[PDB]
Paper text:
The envelope spike (Env) of the human immunodeficiency virus type 1 (HIV-1) mediates infection of target host cells and is consequently a main target for vaccine design. In addition, a dense coat of host-derived, immunologically “self” N-linked glycans shield the underlying protein from host antibody responses (Wei et al., 2003). Whereas the Env glycan shield typically limits antibody neutralization, many bnAbs have, paradoxically, evolved to recognize epitopes that are either entirely or partially composed of N-linked glycans (Blattner et al., 2014, Doores and Burton, 2010, Falkowska et al., 2014, Huang et al., 2014, McLellan et al., 2011, Pancera et al., 2013, Pejchal et al., 2011, Scharf et al., 2014, Walker et al., 2009, Walker et al., 2011). Currently, the most widely studied recombinant Env mimics are the BG505 SOSIP.664 trimers, based on the subtype A transmitted/founder virus sequence, BG505.
The secondary binding sites make contact with the D2- and D3-arms of the oligomannose-type glycans at positions N332 and N339. As expected, the N295A and N392A deletions resulted in a substantial decrease in antibody binding. Previous site-specific glycan analyses of BG505 SOSIP.664 trimers have reported the N295, N332, N339, N386, N392, and N448 sites to be occupied by oligomannose-type glycans, predominantly Man9 (Behrens et al., 2016, Cao et al., 2017). The BG505 transmitted/founder virus naturally lacks the conserved N332 glycan site, thus this glycan was also included (T332N) in the BG505 SOSIP.664 trimers to introduce the “supersite” epitope (Sanders et al., 2013). However, the BG505 sequence also lacks glycans at the 241 and 289 positions, despite their presence in 97% and 72% of HIV-1 isolates, respectively.
Author numbering:
A (entry chain I), B (entry chain G), C (entry chain B): 523 to 547, 567 to 661
D (entry chain E), E (entry chain F), F (entry chain A): 35 to 58, 65 to 141, 150 to 185, 189 to 309, 312 to 321, 321A, 322 to 397, 412 to 501
The structure:
Amino acid sequence: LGAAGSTMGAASMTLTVQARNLLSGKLTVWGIKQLQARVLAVERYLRDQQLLGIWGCSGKLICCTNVPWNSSWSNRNLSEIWDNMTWLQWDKEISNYTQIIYGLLEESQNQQEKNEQDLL
Amino acid sequence: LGAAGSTMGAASMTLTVQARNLLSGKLTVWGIKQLQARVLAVERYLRDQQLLGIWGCSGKLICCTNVPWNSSWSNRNLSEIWDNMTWLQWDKEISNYTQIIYGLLEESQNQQEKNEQDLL
Amino acid sequence: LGAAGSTMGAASMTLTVQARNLLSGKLTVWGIKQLQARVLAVERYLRDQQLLGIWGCSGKLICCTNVPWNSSWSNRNLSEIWDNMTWLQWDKEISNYTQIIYGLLEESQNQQEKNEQDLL
Amino acid sequence: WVTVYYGVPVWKDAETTLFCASDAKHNVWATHACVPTDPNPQEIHLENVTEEFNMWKNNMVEQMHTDIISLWDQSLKPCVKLTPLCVTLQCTNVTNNITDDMRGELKNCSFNMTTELRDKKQKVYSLFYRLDVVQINKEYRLINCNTSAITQACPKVSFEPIPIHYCAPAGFAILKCKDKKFNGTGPCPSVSTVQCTHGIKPVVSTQLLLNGSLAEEEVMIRSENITNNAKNILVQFNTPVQINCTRPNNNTRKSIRIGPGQAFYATGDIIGDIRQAHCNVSKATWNETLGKVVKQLRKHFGNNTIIRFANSSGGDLEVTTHSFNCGGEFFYCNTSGLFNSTWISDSITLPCRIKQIINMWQRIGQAMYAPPIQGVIRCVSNITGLILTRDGGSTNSTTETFRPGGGDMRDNWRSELYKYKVVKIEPLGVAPTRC
Amino acid sequence: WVTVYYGVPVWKDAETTLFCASDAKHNVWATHACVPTDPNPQEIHLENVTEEFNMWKNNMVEQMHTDIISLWDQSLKPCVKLTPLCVTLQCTNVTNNITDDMRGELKNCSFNMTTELRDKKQKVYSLFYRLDVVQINKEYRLINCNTSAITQACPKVSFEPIPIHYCAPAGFAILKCKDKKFNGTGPCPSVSTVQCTHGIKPVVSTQLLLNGSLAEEEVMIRSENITNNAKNILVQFNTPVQINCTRPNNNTRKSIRIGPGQAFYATGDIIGDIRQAHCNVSKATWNETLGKVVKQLRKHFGNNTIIRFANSSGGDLEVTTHSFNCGGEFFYCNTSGLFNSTWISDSITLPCRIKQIINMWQRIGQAMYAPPIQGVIRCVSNITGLILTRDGGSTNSTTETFRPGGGDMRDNWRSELYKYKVVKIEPLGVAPTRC
Amino acid sequence: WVTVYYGVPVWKDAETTLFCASDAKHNVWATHACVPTDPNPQEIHLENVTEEFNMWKNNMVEQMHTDIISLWDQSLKPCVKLTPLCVTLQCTNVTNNITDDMRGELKNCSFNMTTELRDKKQKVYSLFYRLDVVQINKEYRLINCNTSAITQACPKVSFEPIPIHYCAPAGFAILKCKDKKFNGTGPCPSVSTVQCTHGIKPVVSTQLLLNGSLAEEEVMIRSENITNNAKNILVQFNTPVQINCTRPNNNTRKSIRIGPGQAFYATGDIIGDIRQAHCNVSKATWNETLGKVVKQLRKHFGNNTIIRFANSSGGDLEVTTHSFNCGGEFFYCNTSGLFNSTWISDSITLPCRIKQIINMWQRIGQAMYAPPIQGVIRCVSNITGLILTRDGGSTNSTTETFRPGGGDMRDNWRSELYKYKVVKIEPLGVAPTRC
Ligand SMILES: *[C@@H]1O[C@H](CO)[C@@H](O[C@@H]2O[C@H](CO)[C@@H](O[C@@H]3O[C@H](CO[C@H]4O[C@H](CO)[C@@H](O)[C@H](O)[C@@H]4O)[C@@H](O)[C@H](O[C@H]4O[C@H](CO)[C@@H](O)[C@H](O)[C@@H]4O[C@H]4O[C@H](CO)[C@@H](O)[C@H](O)[C@@H]4O[C@H]4O[C@H](CO)[C@@H](O)[C@H](O)[C@@H]4O)[C@@H]3O)[C@H](O)[C@H]2NC(C)=O)[C@H](O)[C@H]1NC(C)=O
Ligand SMILES: *[C@@H]1O[C@H](CO)[C@@H](O[C@@H]2O[C@H](CO)[C@@H](O[C@@H]3O[C@H](CO[C@H]4O[C@H](CO)[C@@H](O)[C@H](O)[C@@H]4O)[C@@H](O)[C@H](O[C@H]4O[C@H](CO)[C@@H](O)[C@H](O)[C@@H]4O[C@H]4O[C@H](CO)[C@@H](O)[C@H](O)[C@@H]4O)[C@@H]3O)[C@H](O)[C@H]2NC(C)=O)[C@H](O)[C@H]1NC(C)=O
Ligand SMILES: *[C@@H]1O[C@H](CO)[C@@H](O[C@@H]2O[C@H](CO)[C@@H](O[C@@H]3O[C@H](CO[C@H]4O[C@H](CO)[C@@H](O)[C@H](O)[C@@H]4O)[C@@H](O)[C@H](O[C@H]4O[C@H](CO)[C@@H](O)[C@H](O)[C@@H]4O[C@H]4O[C@H](CO)[C@@H](O)[C@H](O)[C@@H]4O)[C@@H]3O)[C@H](O)[C@H]2NC(C)=O)[C@H](O)[C@H]1NC(C)=O
Ligand SMILES: *[C@@H]1O[C@H](CO)[C@@H](O[C@@H]2O[C@H](CO)[C@@H](O[C@@H]3O[C@H](CO[C@H]4O[C@H](CO)[C@@H](O)[C@H](O)[C@@H]4O)[C@@H](O)[C@H](O[C@H]4O[C@H](CO)[C@@H](O)[C@H](O)[C@@H]4O[C@H]4O[C@H](CO)[C@@H](O)[C@H](O)[C@@H]4O)[C@@H]3O)[C@H](O)[C@H]2NC(C)=O)[C@H](O)[C@H]1NC(C)=O
Ligand SMILES: *[C@@H]1O[C@H](CO)[C@@H](O)[C@H](O)[C@H]1NC(C)=O
Ligand SMILES: *[C@@H]1O[C@H](CO)[C@@H](O)[C@H](O)[C@H]1NC(C)=O
Ligand SMILES: *[C@@H]1O[C@H](CO)[C@@H](O)[C@H](O)[C@H]1NC(C)=O
Ligand SMILES: *[C@@H]1O[C@H](CO)[C@@H](O)[C@H](O)[C@H]1NC(C)=O
Ligand SMILES: *[C@@H]1O[C@H](CO)[C@@H](O)[C@H](O)[C@H]1NC(C)=O
Ligand SMILES: *[C@@H]1O[C@H](CO)[C@@H](O)[C@H](O)[C@H]1NC(C)=O
């Protein structure tokens, strides 16, 4: 985490670095913890990879979908949002729509890209 | 599992939902089970993801390859197979060719897409 | 491992076979080992999959990037290197540049493919 | 041409490890360690889907049994050993106020016990139930002393059954049979998918099934083979029968230090007078219910048959009596007052015995000592079913007799898990197309 | 339009399992099992980032406590039981060369002990400290014999604290507060990210905090609620105070076989004369330091107040004395010589007691017996802080009195972990754009 | 340009955890827990591949040793303790029918043993072998009673070696050396890859290696340093030698209850007469085989040398005798009848001793008591190799003497695992191209 307090725009050209350490890769006291620590890192990693799989990106870090931005979703200028404020600040307001956005990210893209390219 | 007894054709526009819950994401009685339960879910998930990796799809749910359909593989009309019968029913007959089909899915695509695009 | 002592050129048309068995997929003596054996296979598998994710390939086995080959990196003819010598032999000399190459594989591709396609 | 699909609804019979979930104190089933349940465990009905079940080949039963026994032993492990009680005992009868039947049932007995300082003994006494001692030729020894170590259950651990839900790991699912006449085997059209079963309380009993689920409409008769006298018949009622059990003696307990932080809970003196610790079964409800059981049994034997009931013919207390547990106390009630009469075409009281040294799960080794409870015990349970066996002999004419057989706790589980099977999901398959 | 980004610097408060790391013999904290530390644990300063901390709600403390107690019990598990020592003891005074104060402190005491062949006893004797025995009406028993089993620590296991680093699992991180005046709670502008904390030695003590970290500039006063007399005040010094402790008696030990590979280490005869086993605190440094403590306490009470010190008012030795451990020996020192005088506007010596039967972590059950050490013990420690409590009563005018209270080892941890919090990284989020 | 390939055949020396596999009762090696083996464990020959091996630095040996010792202790954990047998014993000689040599070998001995009721003792007797008792000044104690607790092996657990296969976790592989003259170290051109080793029976012995694999063509001589007298020389035969061992005494056993489910198996009376329990080695085969061993030893010393054999010079029974196990019985045979004569240019019988209290793995603590076997024991084994040491002194001229040294079970493993090494696969690499 080096992007820190830089703005979301600025914070984009460093996603690689943070991504790199997300996975990293008897019994008795400590041995138990080390085992579950390894299991947890794996479970969390995959928990998110499948989501980018479903929100058809896969070749991640940065990707775009076919969902329009809603005006209720903190409709503020791009000149502020993707230039003069940080992720953390953004997450604090946008997170209210997390499930809504995620449902749209999954289905709007899969309903229109899949099926259509199977016909074609 | 909501596609249930719908036909394979119908069952296509819901693959997202089933896929979503495939991964989901001390010691003593129960604690042991919970640990292996988590390990197993991960192992099964990856066991299949690598296969779609090899049968060059990755950006899964639905994908196509360069393998022709064999006439021995339940050659029945598409108007029945992908319209008026269920997966379960299909699996009961097509599964006899599982290894044959899988070997073809891996190599016919990798032999012709890879190498050819390395030359190009 | 069947490519064995075949040359790197020859060893290419078999990457599928080796890749297939990389993942494969109480307590007391033996039970402990079996559990960590499963955990380890998973951790190693993912440890590498994320790297091919970052070195934007994903649809792996064979892929190309936008990094030029350096003359310090065993500059020997392709007619030897990718025709008349084995991986093992190659790794013994090229490995001296592992971190250098890897850093370039990650960033040269992500800096130029991402951002550029976000503008476009 | 050949195309592949991933999230396809295809499953196969499978066996995996299922885990506990609970609604989230410190009882014997440690159901704190189970992780809280799903507030919205919505089933997915599978439209136009058939399925096949067999309760008599269902491995979910084996896991429930395995988990309970293992858990039982775990919970009793870090507790006081009673090895020092295996000494010659000097016993007499408790005769202060015998209420006729409890004549030889309670014994007043003394012994030389180990103290904190292992060079001096103390003379102590406690009360024992007749079933817990053996006379050695008025000298006695504890029953099972010659067979196994006796361990005192930790006094703070509750034995009240708490519903346990079994849940599948991701990639697996549990299918639930919704055919409300399902006899335990064969096809069950109309099935739903759940990630977790409903909660099942780990209630243990013999002869009469307590606090279980009820049949939806009719009393159900289920057996692996109804004509095989070696198999049990499980009967699931479609209505509860109330049973009220008590142990009226007002008890006291003594704490006797044996060693350095090691103490035994002795049954102390009894306050007031003595009672049989009987159970009440509503009379009309019980026999009316049996009339329903008979109506259904006839379907497999003939509508002109005679159904007779009789009591258990013999064997260990766990198979001759109604074994159950209330508050941690162990009861063995006489059910000969229930399994009687014949069908051709007010309150029942059951005397009971109390026993403190219990060999659970019908094992030879390992005995548990139930510490005394001082408060007067009262418990009300729902009889939800029966374990019956068909008798043998010539089984001639049209007359058959059923008895309250029992033993093997796996059947009690089986009676709740019969609606479920474990399957694995194989989210990958191919089909022909033109693309 | 809606686009998604992965490696975004977003984190939330979180609780996970942290694990041990060490710099990589066989001490009580088994820090061989911890995996070697990172030779280059470079922190990442987070530019333009604020954060909020609360040392009094920090779950890292609970894990450190849990791990230490569990680990302690693990290490002492495979050791010799001293149950056979709970016998009547015949004790007299050690009077060969009493140096005035050690008058009734050492007792010479004999007993009939179990031998390898369990049909013959041996007559043996050993020395005991007064605090380890109870007179029973000159017959004695070991203290806590009537309460718990006593286990001898394995003689080869070191009790020297080794720094332990806590590390986060991937997907998690630990944030470090760099505001060098942070009072333990609220916002801490200027935070850095680490995967691991610095090493913290698991030093256990009461009243005086030893061998911890120092405050960067000023003496820091920290409390959950400084006006709540039920809460402790932790004081972190910005300079060490030297404390020198000794146990001058030249000891010997005897090995008494009790059984088949089971042996007890008895305090043997003392060579030479007897001493109080006192501790020296540099006089000027100590009281100068208190002057600094007072200057800072005044900020919360008024600059016209009177700060007075007094000793602990009463309770168990762990809360009335300076409990600490040197070389495996357990000291209980009298700190009334330190907590004295009043602020308005050479060497101190503390007598101490030695005790071998220790109930650690203030539990009722489980006692550990510290085997004797023959070499003369000397240890030098850094006093790095205090545990103080504000007294009660009418607390009138401008005068307040503080005492060296203590107990509950979680506060010692808390004093080192206050700069850290655990967060989880959620590397996924969306933002608007036009693409 | 720079391109990357994944499934590349590149591996490095590596150390990981290997796991058990078996062909899938309840023996001491719990090989039910191992998961069934691969019906078709096809090796992959690596064409044009060289590799380097070192059997004397092979960590597979350390895991096999670690697993066996841990497993041994696990299997013997839940068993009857014999602590109560450490009492004064009153022993005499068994003189009913001594067959000359077995003069002082069997003792008839009585003692006062604990009973189910711990207030009364029983007078019992049993037979002991001379090697299991110590005379205390005809009073005796059990050997090792003064050193360690003695535990009775559970009577139902088999000690018959079952082949164990070691398997690599995915991402790892085991390479097998196919050079059929490999001397244990250095390059081994011609290597194949397997996921699992062949099965190795965990046979334990000293001096003579039993039931192992055979050399493909020649007798092989292997050592870390053949000129270092501190190192052992392992000899692998290219042909088996038959050895037939017996324990002819027809035994009985008594079961003596000690406590509440705790019982000891005592050697009971012997039916018929007494025998030495000797072993037969085919005479010609044995010495012919040594002639082959000599022919090969000469290659390292000179073709004009003298090779002499002598017996073990001294030490514990495990290094002076042929230690082995048949049916759970422990034999110590005298091999001085084998290691004899000199090479310049019918049946052998070995007397043996029987011992019941065994300290396995040459540890000081923990003794196991082998319960008696009633049936007459007969076993036939394959001698497959030798453990030899080169003697010292001036080692002058051309004459050298070898002795049947031994101890340290790791060498027996090493003798089977020498053909294998563990490597890790690193399926990722780059190479130049133009694309
Ligand atoms: C195991 O232990 C458990 C725990 O104790 C046992 O369960 C208990 O069983 C009891 C008996 O069945 C039961 O008691 C009944 O509760 C009913 C519920 O009433 C509730 O509402 C009223 C409203 O004010 C409250 O006051 C009351 O507290 C409750 O909240 C009552 O309605 C029942 O009363 C009837 O029976 C009693 C018996 O003595 C009569 O005295 C009473 O008058 C009622 O009977 C009249 O009505 C019936 C209706 O058909 C007529 O048939 C009957 O002849 C009576 O009618 C005549 O008389 C009345 C009055 O003179 C007159 O007006 C009318 O015109 C007629 O002349 C009764 O109180 C407990 O609640 C129950 N406890 C629990 C927790 O469930 C269990 O059974 C035990 N099991 C076994 C095997 O023993
Ligand atoms: C079939 O299903 C039924 C219905 O669920 C089930 O009946 C229930 O059985 C349990 C276990 O026997 C009963 O629980 C006990 O009830 C008594 C009665 O308390 C009443 O009054 C209090 C007043 O506040 C109410 O809160 C309560 O709801 C009742 O109205 C309690 O006293 C028991 O608690 C004590 O014992 C526990 C045992 O582990 C302790 O954990 C607990 O802390 C209490 O112990 C303390 O007090 C003791 C008094 O002597 C003392 O000795 C201890 O040392 C300690 O101080 C307990 O709650 C429950 O009430 C029954 N339900 C009903 C409706 O009656 C059947 O058992 C079940 N059948 C089968 C076969 O499983
Ligand atoms: C706050 O921080 C300080 C500074 O770190 C810390 O002080 C240190 O405490 C430890 C533990 O008490 C001290 O360690 C002991 O030191 C003695 C003295 O040895 C000196 O001379 C040798 C000569 O080569 C030097 O190497 C050494 O550095 C010293 O100069 C040692 O003798 C102790 O070792 C024995 O006891 C250990 C206990 O487990 C054994 O493991 C070890 O093998 C040794 O035992 C052997 O000898 C014994 C002699 O009688 C014998 O009885 C045993 O059976 C066995 O044979 C040990 O190293 C350390 O020196 C202190 N540091 C300083 C600078 O003095 C404070 O304790 C800490 N405060 C708190 C409260 O934690
Ligand atoms: C090198 O490799 C060789 C070859 O594999 C190996 O030899 C074998 O050693 C084992 C172990 O000593 C031998 O196994 C025993 O054989 C006896 C003889 O039984 C014969 O007759 C029966 C009749 O049906 C045949 O089935 C059988 O194959 C033989 O022909 C058996 O009696 C033994 O079984 C008893 O002891 C077991 C010990 O755990 C029990 O588990 C088992 O249940 C049996 O016990 C019961 O009977 C006992 C009789 O007194 C009674 O006391 C018990 O309480 C219980 O009731 C066992 O099978 C095997 O036969 C040998 N193989 C050959 C070809 O002879 C070498 O040992 C090996 N060398 C080394 C050093 O490892
Ligand atoms: C962007 O800034 C302009 C400046 O006047 C303002 O009018 C407009 O509404 C802003 N857009 C949003 C979404 O805030
Ligand atoms: C499809 O249906 C037509 C109808 O006549 C039939 O002739 C044809 O063979 C069918 N194809 C297959 C593959 O069954
Ligand atoms: C390739 O071979 C030619 C042959 O003369 C040589 O001149 C050239 O330098 C070689 N290239 C490399 C990179 O070795
Ligand atoms: C206690 O021991 C004495 C010893 O003589 C015996 O007389 C007495 O009966 C014993 N007491 C009991 C209750 O067994
Ligand atoms: C040992 O036992 C004897 C038995 O009479 C007793 O007199 C003696 O005092 C005991 N010794 C000790 C030290 O307790
Ligand atoms: C048993 O104890 C009595 C007590 O006097 C002793 O005489 C006898 O010899 C003991 N028996 C044995 C076999 O040790």
